[PDB]
Write a protein that binds this ligand. Structure first.
Ligand SMILES: Nc1ncnc2c1ncn2[C@H]1C[C@H](O)[C@@H](COP(=O)(O)NP(=O)(O)OP(=O)(O)O)O1
Ligand SMILES: [Mn+2]
Ligand SMILES: [Mn+2]
Ligand code: NA
Ligand code: NA
Length: 325
DNA sequence: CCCACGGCCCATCACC
DNA sequence: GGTGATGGGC
DNA sequence: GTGGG
């Protein structure tokens, strides 16, 4: 919010690279720039000034100058005029359409929401839903509403089995007053790392949430990972917006490693994994393993609470709300 | 003065 | 029908 | 596009 005009300008450039040029590195750099550029406590008022920030370099500093000097940036503007590049960017905002599906659709003449519907034949299921809820999906969720959602989920999960475990992770757990999707994490004592596999254990609890017409439609669904759509109920009235809900089922013993992952910033999850590597470990969404001076991953370490990981690699315990990187 | 640069689950497609 | 690769998302 | 090396 300090250097806001810059963060926006860069976030656009990042989306462009990801969406159009399929240059994920140049994308991530603009994000790390723009990400860790607002972590900065000082109004940037020089590209040369900005260059001193980590991940900000010659080109971005060159581009920052033009924005500070003229209030615009020719490059981005040129992209906005390209009727094609703009059409590729936009479509990716549909869920299920990525850089590949999007460049392939604009080639064949599909440039707008209007074409998508006409060409619904071409679209696969996930994309058929991202279209349906295109508007409601670009809205943010406020905690007040999120809090309601959290009550239903827990209610209907226990009602299936008293021994279940379910924690709302992601933006919400970090104090985030606004949220994009609802990230959920499910476990059971009867599901641990050394058990064969899940006997309808995730399906069981999804059905209930569909039975109470909370989960409306379904984007993807497997034995471990469910992506879908949910909605709150209104009294009297105006309908609530449809929202994205991710539900992930993990084994109980690995629970504290997934809660940590699926909560802390994608950058945070990257900030800490770096330290863990420098500090001799390799963590992931399920385990924290040690690495011999050769680099050979050892057997999974014992984890009984989120704080455990944050001693192994040391680091200052950043409690979820402080983890907004 | 170059060049790694992140990993996992689900769904679909191309090929057989 | 069963593959292995790829795309997409998070 | 960037910074480690
Ligand atoms: N490569 C990666 N890919 C996906 N998720 C990652 C990740 N690295 C870390 N995560 C962690 C970080 C994420 O928090 C978590 C999934 O949450 P999201 O729905 O992706 N985004 P969030 O909940 O943070 O905010 P909001 O929903 O309001 O936009 O997984
Ligand atoms: Mn989220
Ligand atoms: Mn999510
Ligand atoms: Na720098
Ligand atoms: Na999208």
């Amino acid at each position: 919010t300090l250097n806001g005009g810059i963060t926006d300008m860069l976030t656009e450039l990042a989306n462009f690279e990801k969406n159009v040029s399929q240059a994920i590195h140049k994308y991530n750099a603009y994000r790390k720039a723009a990400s860790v550029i607002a972590k900065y406590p000082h109004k940037i008022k020089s590209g040369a000034e900005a260059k001193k920030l980590p991940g900000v370099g010659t080109k971005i500093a060159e581009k920052i100058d033009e924005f500070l000097a003229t209030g615009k940036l020719r490059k981005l503007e040129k992209i906005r005029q390209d009727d094609t590049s703009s059409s590729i960017n936009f479509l990716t905002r549909v869920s299920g359409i990525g850089p590949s599906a999007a460049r392939k659709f604009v080639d064949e003449g599909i440039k707008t929401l209007e074409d998508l519907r006409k060409n619904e034949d071409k679209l696969n299921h996930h994309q058929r839903i991202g279209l349906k809820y295109f508007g409601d999906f670009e809205k943010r969720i406020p905690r007040e509403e999120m809090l309601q959602m959290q009550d239903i989920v827990l209610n209907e999960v226990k009602k299936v089995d008293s021994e279940y475990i379910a924690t709302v992770c992601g933006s919400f757990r970090r104090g985030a007053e606004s949220s994009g999707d609802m990230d959920v994490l499910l476990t059971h004592p009867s599901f641990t790392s050394e058990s064969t596999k899940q006997p309808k254990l995730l399906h069981q609890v999804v059905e209930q949430l569909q039975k109470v017409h909370f989960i409306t439609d379904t984007l993807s669904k497997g034995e471990t990972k469910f992506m879908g759509v949910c909605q709150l109920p209104s009294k009297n009235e105006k309908e609530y917006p449809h929202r994205r809900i991710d539900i992930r089922l993990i084994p109980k013993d690995q629970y504290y490693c997934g809660v940590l992952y699926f909560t802390g910033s994608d950058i945070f999850n990257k900030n800490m994994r770096a330290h863990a590597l420098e500090k001799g470990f390799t963590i992931n969404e399920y385990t924290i393993r040690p690495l011999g001076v050769t680099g050979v991953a050892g057997e999974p370490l014992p984890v009984d609470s989120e704080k455990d990981i944050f001693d192994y690699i040391q680091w200052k315990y950043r409690e979820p709300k402080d983890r907004s990187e």
